[PDB]
């Protein structure tokens, strides 16, 4: 868990690439180096991973 966050919106992945997230949801950050709009997480509880808003993502 080097980098973790929490989830402030609620999004549904439209593309394979994507990650659905729920508000308050706990995600590891994997990648926020590549794209400032686009963030790699996972979700910690169910292990999903995928690409989401970097401005849904709140750093703890």
Not at 12 to 37: F, H, N, P, R
């Amino acid at each position: 868990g080097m980098e973790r966050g929490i989830v402030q919106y609620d999004f549904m992945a439209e593309s394979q690439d994507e990650l659905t997230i729920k508000s308050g949801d706990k995600v590891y950050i994997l990648d926020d180096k590549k794209s400032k709009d686009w963030w790699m997480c996972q979700l910690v509880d169910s292990g999903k991973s995928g690409l989401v808003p970097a401005q849904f993502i709140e750093p703890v």
